[PDB]
Structure formats: C-alpha cells, structure tokens
Amino acid sequence: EDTEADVPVTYGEMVLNGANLVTALVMRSLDDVGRHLLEMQEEQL
Amino acid sequence: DVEFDALLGSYCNTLSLVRFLELGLSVACVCTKFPELAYMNEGRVQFEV
C-alpha cells in the first residue's frame, strides 16, 4: 500500500517522580529546615 | 504506592561536637602541635636539677 513511511526520531525521556527527602543545615530559625525543602523541591520542577 | 513527608515541629541533633579545650582536663596538658611530627626521629627534652 505504501513505500515511504514516517518514523519517530527523538528518544523518549524520563522524569523523576518522588524521592527520599534528605537535607541538612548548619545552625536562622528552626523552620528554615522546612523552607529549604520547598526550595530543593522547586528545583526538580 | 509509596509516601513521603517532613515534620515541622521537631528537628534532630545529629552531631555532638566535643572540643578537648572545652574540657576541664585540658589543664594537665601542654597542647602544642607540630604540623611536622612524622618526619622526626627521637626528639629529646632536657632537665637541669
């Protein structure tokens, strides 16, 4: 029925969904541990 | 499924940093350091009585 077909080019990629939450700090209130998380989450988006 | 979270009420104490000069024992020393001791053979200390 046909000769010249179409073929995809670029490979499929992946995305990180979920991770262990692991951080640290060097003692700045005690909530900054929390705020730094959202920071380190906002990166992956 | 799997789940995750983080508290906001309680934070850990991982390290307990103990310095020797914070102790009361550091009287009984004379803590002078070399940055070169491994290069040294028999060193000597003199006394005149």
UniProtKB/TrEMBL annotation, chain A:
Coiled coil: none
Full protein name: Major capsid protein
Source species: Human herpesvirus 2
Residues of the full protein shown: 296 to 344 of 1374
